[PDB]
Every structure is written in C-alpha cells, then in structure tokens.
Design a protein around this ligand. Structure first.
Ligand SMILES: [Cl-]
Ligand SMILES: [Cl-]
Ligand SMILES: [Cl-]
Ligand SMILES: [Cl-]
Ligand SMILES: [Cl-]
Ligand SMILES: [Cl-]
Lengths: 124, 128, 135, 135, 135, 135, 124, 128, 135, 135, 124, 128
C-alpha cells in the first residue's frame, strides 16, 4: 500500500531534491536534503508511475529500493520520511502537462537544487 | 431534469481511463472515467450519436460542461466503470480555472469532442 | 459611494449570457482578450442607435491582493434600468459595483498594469441542453 | 530572524500600487511574466539618485512543499521606513518577510528551479474611479 | 432627398471588389462581421492620408420588411467622384443611396437592432480565372 | 374570424420600429434569435402602468406546409387602436392576423415544434439619416 | 413511381404529425391529423430515403405499408392524401443538415404535435 | 470563354453522388454531380491538378463558384454522369444565400477543395 | 530636425520584444496587419492608465525607393525615457527616428498608399532557448 | 535610344509621390497588386482636360535574366518637361528609361508572361510629419 | 557535369523562350530567341530535374538532346549558349512553390513569348 | 552556449532531403539537410523529444530559428548527412524575408514542427 509523501518533507532554506519528469510529445520538489545526493560515478532504483486522480488532478506513485530508501532517509531534513511505496499529489496547474501527454513519461530524473542568498537565515 | 455532478471519485488511480477531449471553435483533455477495460463501439458507430454536451458558465469565472448520455452508452460506461455505476443520464463536469477561461473565450462553442482510451502505467496493477 | 459586489449568483446556467469583452494595452496578439460573463439575461442586450457600452459604463480594474484584481464600474441610469429589466436574477444591478476576478483572470489584468485598451458587450445564447438545464 | 507573511490585506483597491516584478531564468512558456501587486501606497516610491533596488531589497525564492513556493525578502532600514511611510494599510513592512506565490506562479518558480534573473519595483497609478473607490 | 438603389449590376465578376466591412453592436465574438460586396473597381480604393471610410460616408441600416433591411448611405463629394472614377460599371454612385440586403444578411442587422459598432473598407482582388471570367 | 396577413408594406424605412421578439424552447443553435420588425411607428409604444403584453396580445405558431410557418395573433381592442394610431402605414392592424416566417425562421419554428417560451414587443429608434430617408 | 406529398396536406390549426430525422455524426411537418396517431403499445411500416435533388436541395422518399397508409388516410384532415410511394421536397435551409451528414440517417420517427391557444379558431 | 451554369438537373435522385467539399481560409458541401458508379483516379493522382476553382461575387449578396475542368476529368465525369453529358470545360455553380455569406466573409479565399463519392440510399434503385 | 535610424542592432535575440502592430487602411481582412519588431526590452512596456501608444507616438510612413518605405516617428518625452530605461541595447531612442522596412514589409505600406488605419504596442516574451541564446 | 535607369535616389522621403500602378493579365495570386513609388514631386501632377496617360506614356515589360524584369518606358515631351518641373530630385526624367522590378515583382511579371492589362499614375500626398522629414 | 545557363542568355527586346513548370498538388525565362521555336506538328527532348540548393533556394537541372541542343543554339540571340547538361539558379521568391510542392513536377513545357511595343527599340 | 549557423552548403543537389516543416499558431517548408538515405526513428519514437526550436527576431525584419539537437539525433543526422558532419548541438537557421514576415505576424509562436523525408528527382544520381 502506497503512503503519501507529505509537504512537510519540504523545509524552506535547505537544499532541494527535485523530481524532473519529461513527457512524451515538469519539475517537482521532492525532498529537502541536508547535503547533495550523489551516487557513485556512472550509475535507476526508483520507479515512477504518473496516474490520474481527478478530472484535472494527477498523482505520482513511487517504488523506492532499499538502497535509495536508506540514502534518502540519511540525507533528509525532516526525519526518516521515505518508505518503499509512496505518492505525491500534484495540484491542477502541475497536473496539466501530465494530462495532455496522457501520462506518457519520456524520461525522469532527480536533481540537486541549491539554496539562495537568504538560505541559512530562513532555517532560523 | 436534475443534472448530477461527475465528481473526482470516479477517477481511480491504477486503472485505464477514458479521456474526454474537447475542441473549441483551444484543446481540453479531461480524465472522464476510470474503466476496467477499454471501450470500443460497434462496427463504425460513433460516440457523438449517444452523447450530447452543453458548455455553460456558472459564475463570473467558472464554467460547467453539461451532458446527456443516451441509454446504450450509459449502460456500457457503467459496466466498464471501476467506481460503482456513477454514470447518470443528466450530468455535469466542473472545468478548472484555466479550462473555464478558454471555454469563456471560445463563447462556449465546441467544434468537436470525443472519448479516448488511455492505458495504465508501470505500477498500475500494484496501485489497485 | 459604496461599491457593491456583483456576485456569481447573477449567472444562471440555462440562460443567455451578457459578456464583457475587455482588451488590455500591450499583450501578445489580437487573440488576447479577457471575456467576463457579466449577467444572465432573458433576452439580448440591445443599445440605442449609435451608442456603445462605453457611453453608459466606466470601468476601473484595481488590485485586491497579491494575485487578485477587482473590476469596479459605474453604470449610467439608462443601462442600470435596461439591465435590471433584462436580468434573470431579480434586479441585481446598482450604480456602483465590482466583479471579483479569480487568479487566472486577474493575471491578464495585472500583466497589463490594469490598463484597459477598449471594452464592449457581447450576447451569447444557450446550447442544446439549455431549457432542460433551467429545470 | 523569523520571516513574517506580507498578506493580501496590504493591497487596498483605489490607491496607487507598487508592483514587484520577477523574471526567472527559463521554466516559463514564452509570454508568461511574474508581476505581483506588492503594496498599496498613498504616493509613488522614489529611490535616491543612482541607487539600484538590489542595494536595499534582497530576495530568495524557495519551495514550501511539493507545489507551493514563497518569496522571502530582507528589506534594509531606509526602504522599510520609506515603504511604511507611503503604505496605506498601517506599517505592515518588517525587515524579514515572505510572500506566498499562487499555484500557477509557484509552478513557474519550481520549473525555473527558483533561479531569478532580475527583479524590480514599479509604480502603477490608479484608474478613473480610483478616488471614488477609496471611499 | 431621393435615395437611389445601388443595384446588384454594379458587381461584375472578374474584377476587384470593394467590400464594406460592418461590425454591429453586440454579437458573439470578433469573427462576427457583415461583409458586403459594395462595388467592382478597376483598381483598389485608396484614401487620403489619415482618412478612413467613416470620414466620407454615413450609413444607416433600416428595416424594409419583416426580415429585410436596407443600408442607406450619404456619400461625401470626394468619395462619390473617386468611386465613379474607379467603378467598372459606368458611374453608378450618387450622393444618396441604399443597398438591399437579402434575408440572410439582414438577420445580423436585425438582431443588433440596426446598431452599427464600426465599419471600414477592404479591397479584394480577383482569383486565378478572373481575366477569363471578364470575357 | 379569418386571419389577415400583416404584410411587409407596413414597414416603412426611416421611421421608428416596433420589434416582435420570440424565443422558442430549443429547436435552435445557440446564437440564433428570432427578431421581427413588426410595425413602423411615428412614435414609441408605451403600455400603461404594470401591464404585461400577454394581456393584450396573443400568439400561436403553426405550420402552413412542410417548410413554412405562420405566426397567428389575436390583438385586443386597446392595443389595436393604439398601434393603428402610432402606425405609419394607414391602419393596417386587425384583431386576427398572421405573419409569415421566412424559410430559415420557419425551420427554427419547426425544429422547436412551435413551442414558444416568451415573446415581447420593443421600440427601436431610427438612425442618423432617418428623418432624411422618410422624405 | 413516387408521388409528391404536397403542402396542402398541412392545414393550420389542426394537430400535426411531425417527421423527425436524426442524422449520423431535423423536424418536418408531415400531415395534419384529425386526432393523434397512436399505434398499439410496444410496436416500422414506412421506409425513408434522403436523396439529393439539387446543389443545395434534398427530397425525402417514402415507402408506406398498406396498414399505415390506411391509418394515415383515416386520420388526415385533407382528404386521403397518402399513397404507397411518395416524396416531400425540402427547401435549402432544411436540406442543409441532410447534405452535411451525406444523407446518412441515424434514426427517424413520427411524433404528434398539438395545436396552440388559437387552434380551433384558425380552423374557421 | 463563356462560363456555363451547372444546374440542378444534373442531380438525379436515387443515384450515387459526387460531393464538392470546400474549405475557406467555414465548410461547404455541395452535391456536384449524380454518377452511375464511383470515381477513383489513377494510382496516387489528385483532382486539384485537373480542376481549378475561382469564387467571385455576383451581386451585393450572392456568390458564384467558377471552374475550369481539364480534359481528362471532363471526359471521366461525362462518362460517369447520369444526366446527359453536362460537364463543359468552363462552368459555374451558384451558391445559396448562406453559402454566399460564408464565401464573402472569407473574402473568396479557398484553403482546399475536393470531390468525394457518396453512396445511394435504401430506396435508391427503386427511385431510379 | 534630424531623423536618426533605429537600426537592426537594437533587436537582440534572447530578450523580450516590443512589437509595433500597424493596421493599414484597405486590405483584405482583419488577419492583415504589419507587425514590426521595434525594440528588445528587459521587461514589458507598460503605459499609464488610460493611455495608448498613439498618445505618445506619431508615425508617418514614407517611400524611400521604388519598393522601399521608411517609417518615421516622433516620440514624446515620457515614452522616449521609458523606452531608453527598458532597452537592452544602450539608450538607442531619440525623439525623431525612422525604421527601414525591407521590400517584403514595404509592399503592404505601398499598397495602402502609406495610409495607416491604427497602430498599437504588443509585448512578446522569449522562447524555451532564450536565456541560452543571450549567451 | 539607349534606356536610362530611373533609380531610387529620385524618391525623397517627406515629399508627395507619383505612384505607378500596373496590373497584369493573371500570373498573380488574388490580392497581390503592383504599386511602384515612381517620382517624389513638389506638387501634384495634373493631366489636361480629357487626356488619357497612354497618350504621353508608353511601357514595355521585358525580362533581363532568368529572374529579373525591367519596365521600359517612352515618355513624350510634354509629360517629361512637366515631371522634370514637378520633380524634387533635379531633372531625372529622360525620354527612354527603365525601372528595375524587385525579385517578387519580377516573378509576378514573369508568371504573367509580361502581359499588361492597364497602367496608371496617381498622386499620393504626405503624412503628418512630411514637412518636418524634408528638413 | 552540368554547366550554368547564365542570365546573359536573356537579351531584352527579343522574344523569349519560357520554361513553364506546373507542380503537383511557375514560369522561368529560358532563352531569348531570334525567332519562335516551332517543332513539326504533333511532336520531349529535354529532361528537367528540380533540386534544392539551399534552405529556400532551388536549381533546375537540364538534360538536352543533340537535336534540341542544335535547334536552340541556332535560334538563340546570345551565341551558342546551350550545352547538353545545364542548370538555372532560381531565387528565393521563385523557389517558393517548388519547395512547397516538394519538387514534384506535374508537367513542364516550353512556350514562345513575343515582345512588347518598344521591342525592336530596346535592341538598340 | 554558442549557436552555429546551418548554412546552405548543407543542401547538396541530387540527394534526398530532410524537410523541416513548421506550423505557426502559416506553413513553413525548409530544406533542412541533404541525406544519403532516409531517416526513420525507432518503433513509435518522435522527433520532438530529440529536437527543440526557438524562433526569435534578429532585426526589424529578419527572424532566426534556433535549435537544440539532442545527442541521439545529432549522431544520426551526421551519419546520414551528405556534407561533412554539419550538425552541432546548438544551431540556427535564417528565415528568408517572406518566412520572417509570417513568423513575426505569428508572434514567433509555433504550433507544431517536423522533419520529413523527400526523395530525389529523375536526374538526381547523375547530378551527384
Ligand atoms: Cl459595445
Ligand atoms: Cl514557449
Ligand atoms: Cl476604412
Ligand atoms: Cl448549438
Ligand atoms: Cl497601445
Ligand atoms: Cl489566388
């Protein structure tokens, strides 16, 4: 059964893990992390499934390997939020392109996004 | 006759979908219904003869799509449906803010519409 | 004077629609206009010969939030009366009113710095299920 | 150093406006621009001779969830006292604040990976019914 | 004065067409205009700098039956002469004239209560068989 | 009680108009409305205080063949004397008359199964050349 | 050979039999009747054929069974107008939709249409 | 050259049809000719190379479609025709009131046109 | 005064474009307009409330050859300054200038005998590769 | 009898224009017309009472390569002296000259097999900035 | 190898041989001639190939038979310009329709075009 | 990144062609590249996922089409190319005068684009 990866896993001021979905024919903040995620050079361990949840809503379902589950829980700012089976709810403005592509994913990736000038200061 | 709302519960993650696709006289794609298997009408017969739409405004910014679904399609969609028989003869869908805007700017004038089968994703079966 | 809201209830599905077409200074092309459903009417609005909406109707778009605008207007007496006579909902028009735009509609007003180029009236009828939708 | 929200109440229809204008490095379709009515003011804001806003006003766009983004800012004492003087709602500006982007604006911010190319602050005046709306 | 009919004979297939574009108050959208072929011409109508059709030409739509309208017009001297000089058919324009609309064209005039929003001139050339059609 | 045709001759260009306005229950595309110039009048028609037209004026739409439809009406004595007084063509109104719909109008009437939702009578004034056209 | 069902078979003030054609991808007054046509509960006996007759004209051809031929002749206001093989001429405004559907009929029916307030009075 | 009118006699009830279909730069469908059997040109060859149209106004409200039909198509249409060889090289069709209106509003500007086979109806043979 | 050329260098790929939309008297339809890229800008041009381009800007199309025209213009002080402040290229606008049209653009001006019907401003953003194209 | 080119220098922005207008027998899409600014003039050209231009002015369109075409002309003494008198650039008109068509114009000329149906010469005045442009 | 048929082969005032290409789904001045080309009654001896040469440019390649090569060289105003293998360069305005037809030629021909009123006079 | 111009040398007479076809929101056809053999991507895969365009003005009258070509397509086009490997990741094409005009009037707004194979002509082999 799939558990919701809630908004509280985003903590302003910290760096961000961004999910980035390229559709056939979209960035999503995934996890605030204590430091950048870096796999060893030249190395997926999570599946994504884009599914409709409404007349203009989409959810993203995740299957995350034990290996990446531990690395993410290690790196995460909020405490141990990552489970094996999860989902994110997109809002209508975000769901738009997923709907128009009929949920057909060309490619996805996970990127590190730094913090801006006032970064450490928002953390207090 | 009373127009019943086709609500979001009708879309169930992990199952194939019918997509309502509307062209104004630009292009709306709306997940209409989660179905257990696809939908494919008798030799060369067409949706539009079983399904009437009417776009009207519901306020200063929001718009509704009203529909009359004839008996043959009502029965078929209810059999295919994943959620418990949600199709009534007289229904409406609420368009979102952006979709409403394009409908208003088109003066509610539809060029064409259709229902299309959209298959499930990689983890679909598991999400069920 | 007091500016009273022209509320969404004034639009009644199943009836013809009096639309406000607003054209903003700037923009991309002539496909850019903001159409606002203004009032549901029993019959189309028709104006005296040689008159246009601008002869009876002053508008003013103003911000109401960080991504919201309102459209304020002053309606001359003749139009106020014609509009109350035509309205499906009982006599909703007052001299001084405003329409709340939503965030999608407001974007266009805000990006033009509230500067209206022109505006005019349109009458839109009802679709094939219209009588049925009224009941 | 906790950041206070600059809320909608600080925009008062009928009065001049200070507009915050942000453009991102990409993450936006071609003709989408980010303009935010920032503060209703009693009279225009003027900076002193050759002084770029970036000297008094710092911004940082950051995600607050999977969908929503806030714009955090640090305003120096000069501009703070000036804006609080010009403001219509009573002294709402603090040194450390944030402004909530709407869902659409948040998606452009997210798709731009929060990368700001430039920002600015502009005076926009009131419309023909402005003085009347105030009352 | 006597209003004389501008008859259909004044349109001569094979030649360029001076068109009257009429926009009525109300209506559905900006794709709604009534185009009337006005006169076949030897060359396009060109007007003096800064002048438009409305500076030389007053129109008045009036009903002529239960589903017929006529368009009456008064043509200023300069345009009357330019038009007779350009006309393919020999000198048909008089100061005071009317065009009979048919029942299809009249519908649009009638539904707007004869209220013209604006009007202007267009020049339309001849198609690939045009010279051949002249003979 | 034989019904007399109200013919086109009763519409005289240059003079004000009484417009008969009918809308059917369906049997019409969205933006098609049924407006019929009914009588040219020397001055506007006013009803007395709070008196709905349906009290003086009865209508019945009926087919006259496979394609054409007539609108039959019964006009009470007050309105008849009033319309005959205001009329420009000499006393053409009788108690029992019909009006022929055109082919298009007849098709909307036929497709609506002759079902009238409401009807009304409206004053429309004359255009800028009106007084001149009369003569 | 097919005989024209003329306009004189429509007599104002009387109730109407309406032919109603639904095209794939249109009401027509058919016959004025002395009283409503009612078949016995749960019960076609006429064929229609929509054929072009001009660059913007269509005709409707009818084959009517002996049974319905007699019932219609019984019910008709004008005297015994119904023959076995007939046609109606549509005008251009009526032919429009028949032409745009390439004469492809989804369904047809015959409906009773009452008369309005001034009904009996127009008959005199 | 003299342009001859293609009149309504050319459309004979009960037979298959060629439909002229015109798109302006909305959509005109015009029964063009009653044919004894369909029409289907040589491998991958196209009508437009044998058939030139020119829409022009004939008055303040009516419009005509003028056409030049090249020899190969002239012969073929005359062989297929039901009425006695009515196709000449230079002809015109009169558009109706509504069709005229859309032509005028399009400034006589055609995007595309074509000839399409349309089969007979149920009683067709009998009506012949 | 001296009319100085507003040269092509003033357009800088990668930045938003201030466009001049010009509508000529005559022509075929309302799809006929001549769009001229006028100046690349750091942000969209926004004008004061109730003002349009025509309130600050006079144009004059004149021939410069057998198939070339130039567009001359006089820019009022307020717009000159707003434009120099917005321009990507350093302060290019002077009070009196001209744009060279090429032979394709000139054709439309020439066929209208240089007679402008109306004109207005449009702001066009940058496409998906825009930031990258700037470098 | 060698033909001299009438070059672009003879068109001087800011001054009235004589326009050469040619239409071919076919070889042109419907709405393409051939207008050529011919000579800038200090004041309009008038012909004497009932005298068709063809009496003073002869033209011959001929190819000068696979792509380019010239318009050759023979101008009689009266018109030559008159045009040289009116001209702004000093006496540029000779008895035998040619004018180069541009690539587009040359293609219409080539596709029309150089067949001219008629030609004419028209006065076009100057725009609102005309006197100022001259200087 | 194909040789360019240059513009100098067009001499104003003389009559013209016009190449005329009709595209599937364009006139070109070919040769100024001393007198009209006329083949004997009821009688191609040249191939054309429309090829792209640029993002909006097309060239026309010619293969001309010995027979037509001699007749053309005989008739030509400029001296003996015709070789067996040649090409013409079109400009962008001329290339337009060739590009939009994807270089697919429905038919080509060679036509005689006379000279205008000032014809003999431009030759001097 | 520096945008390199795809110049006319890249089009070599006598060889098949790829045609860039652009639709604005009218229709541009541009010979893009001379290829030694056609181009035909893997089962049901689409150009648009390997190829980004951006139309921008370069002056008061001329317009450029800028493009980012992804690695898979870069390698394929360079292998097929007749001229010596001319495809770089970041390039631009100059539109002609007329093409520029339609781009400007469309406000640089592309509806769709594609690459199409166009075969050689009769004398093609010989011209090589
Ligand atoms: Cl208006
Ligand atoms: Cl974009
Ligand atoms: Cl005008
Ligand atoms: Cl409808
Ligand atoms: Cl403007
Ligand atoms: Cl054409």
């Amino acid at each position: 059964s799939y558990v919701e990866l809630k908004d509280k896993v985003i903590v302003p001021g910290w760096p961000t893990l961004m999910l980035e979905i390229d559709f056939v024919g979209l960035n999503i903040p995934f996890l605030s992390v204590k430091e950048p995620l870096q796999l060893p050079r030249e190395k997926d361990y999570f599946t994504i499934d884009v599914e409709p949840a409404g007349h203009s809503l989409v959810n993203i379902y995740f299957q995350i390997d034990d290996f990446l589950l531990l690395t993410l829980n290690s790196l995460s700012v909020y405490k141990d939020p990552i489970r094996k089976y999860m989902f994110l709810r997109l809002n209508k403005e975000q769901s738009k392109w997923a709907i128009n592509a009929a949920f057909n994913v060309f490619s996805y990736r996970l990127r590190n996004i730094g913090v801006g000038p006032l970064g450490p200061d928002i953390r207090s």
